[PDB]
Design a binder for this molecule. Structure first.
Ligand SMILES: CCCCCCCCCCCCCCCCCC(=O)OC[C@H](COP(=O)(O)OCCN)OC(=O)CCCCCCCCCCCCCCCCC
Ligand SMILES: CCCCCCCCCCCCCCCCCC(=O)OC[C@H](COP(=O)(O)OCCN)OC(=O)CCCCCCCCCCCCCCCCC
Ligand SMILES: CCCCCCCCCCCCCCCCCC(=O)OC[C@H](COP(=O)(O)OCCN)OC(=O)CCCCCCCCCCCCCCCCC
Ligand SMILES: CCCCCCCCCCCCCCCCCC(=O)OC[C@H](COP(=O)(O)OCCN)OC(=O)CCCCCCCCCCCCCCCCC
Ligand SMILES: CCCCCCCCCCCCCCCCCC(=O)OC[C@H](COP(=O)(O)OCCN)OC(=O)CCCCCCCCCCCCCCCCC
Ligand SMILES: CCCCCCCCCCCCCCCCCC(=O)OC[C@H](COP(=O)(O)OCCN)OC(=O)CCCCCCCCCCCCCCCCC
Ligand SMILES: CCCCCCCCCCCCCCCCCCCC
Lengths: 601, 504
């Protein structure tokens, strides 16, 4: 241990070195600096994990300094380490190192190579700050950091203005989420006097014995921040547009760091959520509805990256569903396995895009299983893990644990929502696979291939002691749940093979129909949330900005000068230069003075 | 005893800058640099010897250092200076920005350069005198004294690409705004002095003795309104903000003049020192109006900043929104919100200084301020777009920079006092991110929208780059370790807050 600060400092050193190099170094030097900073962070994480299991999995604390201290407002700069923090840190550092090695191969010959690796190193450092933070304000520092690095990396190809627009949209939506999280922080400090997670959990039951309304508001605002960063309802509109950057950026955001921040926030603050059961059930409802909507929207996309983006939305909805049914271990396990297979899928799609050119539509390319066999194998394994094929994929066991936790807590509607989502997940995943692929052994790809199978399911996160144990289902109930999930996934794969593999008469007949066209247009535009948010926020903001572009308050403060100039021009008419008028004005003034004196008396 | 020299070294330095122009045309910049460095060194020595971190709050008055000398004994007027933690932080900040303003005027060597440096030094000495004076007439004298060198800098040395009459119009608007608000403050000062004279029988303009003057609620409200109008012009508070973007846009295009005269916020200090202690009941009754004016300032400044096609006006309206946050912080009764206001004032000084220096460098490279004529400048310049990205990120309210620390401590304390206003102000933070990203997208990202942007531009010099990097380091250190600043201002802030809440 005593090296968590090293796991933060090494990506920070990489970011500073690669930023101030500003492209002067060779690509080998910048590559080894960035990839080696992330790799040394991963190696220190491995040493930390070995030391953590060497003891009795006890929670370690490393207080660096005191951030701010105004009266009772004492925010410390401290790092913590438990099973949840170790799991998140290992996932972030390991998957980030694999993505960094792939990007070292992949970004060769690109402008801003060192800038790309500086931004990814700062991304990794911000995510490590987010997961290792002892309190809520240091966590907020990491939260904003991952939002900023997402803005910098999504709009990496800055010459295309659409990439910049996508990055700006992502940053603004996640900053609305940050505002919700800040509301949670303000409520929790005003009620409990601290932002430390352990101290907040200890002091929450004593303070809210009479009224629970402010704790409900705090947990609702925590949920708002979590759905902002993890792209859930109602703040999911940025993730689909965020595919403008390089494919390592998409892999990093969708697997390693950014979308897993909301799940970590809900799981870390579970002591506060258990005291507000309605808000936790609302987390489950948000996850179920988000996974259903993402499964609907992913079925009609014409691009691989958009299919994978709505797949990421669906899987994060599964994690939120697991959190809402108080299956915390299943949520973190599914987070780890989804990080594995979604990193694999994004790197394989990047290899597809690099092998092809011009970013062709999925209906353009076809029969690609013979052109690229190994990329087809990587896509096949990643889609099998995403579709939760039984007994060979880690996603099968992850979704099985999520559904078992949903069953054991008496949540039947969330269980059937998860089953429908798994069926649709298999449907859209093998729809994309059978449309694209029908009709050189890099090390990170092989590692993610191994981790996407049951080998990744063999890894058990050390959450016993941090998160409460999920209630155990009966053996017959868990057996019939395994059977039901397996047959649902299998008939999903087979129905996808019957529809899109072949002549495709039936799917074209459905799509060319008027209800088919209406549903395809509705689901393609992410259920119209982009349109609604544009018309409700973006259009009136631009309208007020146009209305105010010539400062109105400045003009209504300028109008005394206008009145003064007008009054001066009016008074200058008495200076006509006529002596008889001057005598007359003197006599008028004499009349006025005498009349005023007689009136006043 | 060092406070009179803190005011006098800028004045003597400006006089020597004017006089030593005959010895050489590139001489007075060194004299200005030496005298601003001497002022900064004396401020740092007062910081080190003051022991502000170990000082406990004992009630107003409580001065770390003091100086008194009779000036107009007929009215009980004396040159009366005093320094505590808040004034010391402001004096160190204006010394640092004065050094930056001298360095930013380097390599601009024309005729009557010594008079330019004289005007700069007199502005800086007037700002320091505002921060140090603790009697009403001397405070008003320093408050109005800065406006003449500022007026002549804007009107005569201003933006050379303008019509010439626009600079005079902007300078005249600035001067009329600030001097009329000052006259309203002088009326409030005189009426307070006469109320004290009728209550006691002795003439005084001393701030220590004018405290606890017995007066009715209406008279106290009127005196508070006069003080607030004077501070609200220079804060700026909407709708009295209109002088500020015109003064920034028509300022001398080095950008040094902004840092010297427009960038610093003596009005928040004025509210803290002379509004809450002198009229605590009136400030307590006025607090809802001032906080709603702050909310309107935040959102109006953000909306105005988004709608600009000029970079300098965008930064000016950014300043308007940040000062709306500070104005919300001042009229709460929180020590935490006051410390956040202090941190936010210092952080706004550093970040706005960086933004204005970078805008001046960009304008001297591309000879236009219209963002519709520039674009894709990340690929054409070496250092400027990345540092501009950092400073826009800082003004956005980014953690790791001191703007976040100040703004979030303001919001924490304000939520403890007024929750609804805090909710609306955090959505104002969202609007701040919107305009910062809009400026970055319009200026440095995309395709070049004109022929001047489709060229390789010369890189920044070592001097400009090193002073920008100094500002970057100071903002980062203030974001990650703000504790020395908080320990410096803690005793003075506690005195102000305990005077404000115990008398209501
Ligand atoms: C902290 C852990 C994580 C927790 C969350 C934290 C979130 C907030 C972090 C904020 C950091 C700043 C982010 C915004 C600025 C990014 C600057 C940037 O993009 O730099 C890249 C750029 C090189 O890009 P390139 O295109 O190759 O070159 C330009 C063309 N020649 O670089 C350059 O051109 C040169 C460098 C420009 C400025 C870089 C950033 C300066 C601030 C950080 C380092 C400061 C110095 C270190 C010491 C601090 C004080 C002790
Ligand atoms: C969010 C990221 C995680 C944090 C690391 C990096 C943060 C940014 C680095 C630049 C700014 C650092 C500012 C703070 C430095 C340390 C402050 C300090 O000396 O604290 C005092 C403390 C002594 O302990 P104590 O007596 O308890 O003090 C309590 C405080 N009142 O002192 C100590 O205990 C010292 C402990 C060791 C600190 C080592 C820090 C090394 C940082 C290297 C970073 C390189 C890149 C910098 C730029 C990054 C981009 C912004
Ligand atoms: C309804 C219930 C659910 C509510 C959920 C919470 C709100 C979700 C909001 C999501 C929508 C955010 C959209 C942001 C898009 C930003 C990117 C973009 O489109 O940029 C375009 C434009 C760029 O600016 P410029 O550089 O001038 O462009 C050149 C060419 N156009 O830039 C712009 O046009 C700037 C657009 C700014 C939009 C500001 C949005 C403010 C959001 C406030 C949320 C309040 C939530 C609570 C509401 C009350 C509840 C009781
Ligand atoms: C579905 C997934 C999750 C989605 C996200 C989560 C749901 C979000 C729904 C709400 C939308 C965001 C607004 C959040 C406001 C939270 C306010 C709050 O918590 O206030 C606490 C405060 C406590 O006061 P209290 O202690 O009760 O006072 C009586 C004495 N005991 O309470 C009060 O003082 C009561 C009134 C508080 C103020 C309410 C209204 C504030 C203004 C909101 C404006 C929003 C739009 C801003 C637009 C800016 C300009 C465009
Ligand atoms: C206990 C429950 C157990 C599970 C029960 C079933 C759960 C739901 C399963 C839905 C999917 C069923 C599978 C078959 C239909 C979908 C596949 C299909 O045919 O897709 C065709 C087309 C998209 O395919 P595409 O590749 O674009 O076109 C071919 C290329 N030219 O597709 C389209 O263009 C649109 C196809 C629409 C298919 C029917 C959808 C029915 C649901 C509509 C919900 C509407 C919203 C909610 C209600 C609002 C109020 C009415
Ligand atoms: C060339 C054309 C253009 C230029 C010229 C335009 C006009 C310029 C002049 C404008 C100001 C007019 C006079 C305003 C002050 C009025 C004073 C007044 O009515 O006083 C009555 C009373 C005095 O107090 P009294 O009641 O005797 O106390 C003993 C027990 N209470 O007072 C009281 O009891 C207290 C009354 C408080 C409310 C009255 C003051 C209103 C001030 C308005 C401006 C400020 C508004 C708020 C802030 C906005 C942002 C700065
Ligand atoms: C330059 C030094 C590089 C050292 C790399 C060390 C790590 C091996 C390569 C990455 C493997 C990632 C595996 C992630 C597994 C996560 C398991 C979490 C368990 C809690």
């Amino acid at each position: 241990m005593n090296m968590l600060a090293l796991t933060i400092i090494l990506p920070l050193i990489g970011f500073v070195l690669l930023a101030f190099s500003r492209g002067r170094w060779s690509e080998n030097v910048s590559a080894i600096v960035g990839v080696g900073s992330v790799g040394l962070a991963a190696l220190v994480t491995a040493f930390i994990g070995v030391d953590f299991f060497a003891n009795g999995e006890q929670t370690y604390s490393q207080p660096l300094w005191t951030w701010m201290s105004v009266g009772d407002f004492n925010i410390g700069f401290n790092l913590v380490l438990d099973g949840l923090s170790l799991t998140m840190l290992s996932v972030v550092t390991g998957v980030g190192f694999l993505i960094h090695m792939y990007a070292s191969w992949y970004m060769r010959g690109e402008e801003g190579y060192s800038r790309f690796f500086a931004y990814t190193n700062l991304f990794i450092a911000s995510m490590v700050v987010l997961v290792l933070a002892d309190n809520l304000l240091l966590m907020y520092l990491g939260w904003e950091g991952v939002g900023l690095c997402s803005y910098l990396l999504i709009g990496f190809y800055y010459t295309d203005p659409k990439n910049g627009a996508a990055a700006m949209k992502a940053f603004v939506v996640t900053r609305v989420g940050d505002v919700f999280l800040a509301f949670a922080l303000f409520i929790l400090y005003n009620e409990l006097g601290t932002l430390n997670f352990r101290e907040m959990v200890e002091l929450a039951p004593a303070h809210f014995a009479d009224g629970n309304n402010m704790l409900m508001w705090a947990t609702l605002m925590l949920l708002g921040g979590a759905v902002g960063k993890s792209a859930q309802l109602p703040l999911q509109t940025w993730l689909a547009d965020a595919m403008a950057g390089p494919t390592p950026v998409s892999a990093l955001i969708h697997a390693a760091t950014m979308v897993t921040a909301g799940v970590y926030l809900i799981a870390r603050t579970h002591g506060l959520f258990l005291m507000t059961p309605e808000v936790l059930h609302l987390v489950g409802i948000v996850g179920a509805v988000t996974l259903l909507l993402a499964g609907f929207a992913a079925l009609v996309q014409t691009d691989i990256k958009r299919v994978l983006a709505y797949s990421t939305m669906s899987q994060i909805g599964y994690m939120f569903l697991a959190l809402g049914v108080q299956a915390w271990d299943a949520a973190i396990f599914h987070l780890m396995t989804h990080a594995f297979f979604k990193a694999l899928l994004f790197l394989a799609s990047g290899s597809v895009i690099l092998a092809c050119h011009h970013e062709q539509n999925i209906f353009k390319m076809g029969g690609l299983r013979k052109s690229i066999p190994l990329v087809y194998l990587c896509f096949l394994v990643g889609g099998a893990a995403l579709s939760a094929l039984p007994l060979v994929t880690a996603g099968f066991f992850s979704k099985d644990e999520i559904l078992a936790g949903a069953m054991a807590n008496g949540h039947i509607n969330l269980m059937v929502a998860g089953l429908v989502g798994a069926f649709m997940t298999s449907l859209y995943t093998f729809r994309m696979i059978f449309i694209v692929f029908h009709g050189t052994h890099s090390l990170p790809l092989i590692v993610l291939l191994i981790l996407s199978t049951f080998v990744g399911a063999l890894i058990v996160p050390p959450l016993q002691g941090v998160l409460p144990q999920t209630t155990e289902l009966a053996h017959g109930s868990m057996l019939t749940l395994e059977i039901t999930s397996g047959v649902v996934a299998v008939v999903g794969i087979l129905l996808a093979a019957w529809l899109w593999l072949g002549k495709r008469t039936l799917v074209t007949s459905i799509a060319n129909s008027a209800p088919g066209r209406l549903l395809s247009t509705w689901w393609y535009n992410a259920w119209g949330f982009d349109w609604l948010y544009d018309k409700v926020f973006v259009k009136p903001f631009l309208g007020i900005a146009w209305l105010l572009k010539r400062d109105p308050l400045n003009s209504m403060m300028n109008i005394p000068a206008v009145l003064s100039r007008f009054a001066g021009k009016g008074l200058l008419l008495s200076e006509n230069g006529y002596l008889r008028w001057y005598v007359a004005s003197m006599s008028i003034g004499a009349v006025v003075v005498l009349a005023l004196l007689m009136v006043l008396r | 005893m060092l406070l009179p020299w803190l005011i006098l070294i800028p004045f003597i330095g400006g006089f020597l800058c004017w006089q030593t122009e005959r010895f050489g045309v590139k001489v007075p910049r060194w004299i200005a640099l030496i005298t601003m460095g001497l002022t900064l060194a004396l401020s740092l020595q007062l910081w080190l010897q003051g022991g502000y971190s170990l000082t406990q709050s004992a009630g107003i008055p409580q001065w770390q250092s003091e100086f008194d000398m009779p000036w107009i004994p007929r009215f009980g007027i004396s040159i009366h200076l005093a320094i505590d933690g808040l004034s010391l932080l402001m004096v160190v900040l204006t010394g640092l920005l004065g050094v930056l303003a001298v360095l930013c005027s380097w390599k601009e060597i024309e005729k009557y350069q010594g008079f330019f440096h004289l005007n700069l030094m007199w502005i800086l000495g007037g700002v320091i005198g505002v921060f140090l004076a603790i009697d009403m007439f001397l405070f008003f004298f320093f408050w109005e004294m800065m406006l003449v060198p500022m007026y002549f800098l804007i009107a005569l040395w201003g933006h050379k690409a303008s019509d010439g009459k626009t600079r005079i119009t902007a300078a005249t608007k600035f001067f009329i705004y600030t001097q009329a608000s000052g006259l309203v403050m002088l009326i409030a000062i005189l009426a307070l002095v006469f109320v004290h004279y009728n209550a006691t029988g002795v003439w005084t303009f001393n701030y220590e003795e004018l405290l606890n003057t017995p007066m009715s609620s209406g008279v106290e409200y009127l005196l508070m309104l006069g003080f607030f109008i004077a501070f609200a012009v220079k804060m700026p508070v909407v709708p009295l903000h209109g002088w500020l973007p015109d003064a920034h846009s028509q300022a001398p295009t080095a950008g040094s003049v902004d840092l010297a005269g427009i960038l610093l916020k003596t009005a928040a200090y004025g509210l803290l020192r002379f509004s809450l202690p002198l009229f605590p009941n009136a400030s307590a009754e006025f607090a809802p109006i001032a906080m709603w004016l702050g909310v309107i300032g935040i959102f109006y400044g953000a909306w105005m900043a988004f709608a600009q096609t000029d970079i300098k006006r965008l930064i000016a309206y950014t300043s308007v929104s940040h000062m709306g946050f500070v104005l919300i912080a001042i009229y709460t009764g929180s020590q935490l919100a006051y410390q956040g206001a202090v941190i936010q004032m210092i952080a706004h000084g550093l970040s706005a200084a960086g933004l204005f220096i970078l805008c001046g460098q960009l304008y001297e490279r591309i000879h236009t301020r219209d963002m519709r004529m520039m674009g894709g400048l990340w690929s054409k310049m070496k250092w400027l777009p990345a540092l501009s990205l950092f400073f826009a990120v800082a003004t956005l309210g980014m953690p790791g920079t001191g703007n976040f620390v100040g703004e979030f401590m303001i919001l924490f304390g304000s939520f403890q006092v007024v929750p609804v206003i805090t909710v609306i102000s955090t959505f104002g933070l969202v609007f701040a991110s919107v305009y910062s990203l809009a400026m970055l997208h319009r200026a440095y990202f995309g395709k070049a929208k004109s022929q001047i942007a489709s060229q390789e531009l010369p890189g920044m010099s070592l001097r400009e780059l090193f002073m920008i990097l100094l500002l970057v380091v100071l903002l980062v250190l203030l974001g990650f370790y703000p504790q020395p600043i908080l320990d410096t201002s803690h005793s003075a802030i506690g005195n102000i807050q305990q005077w404000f809440v115990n008398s209501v």
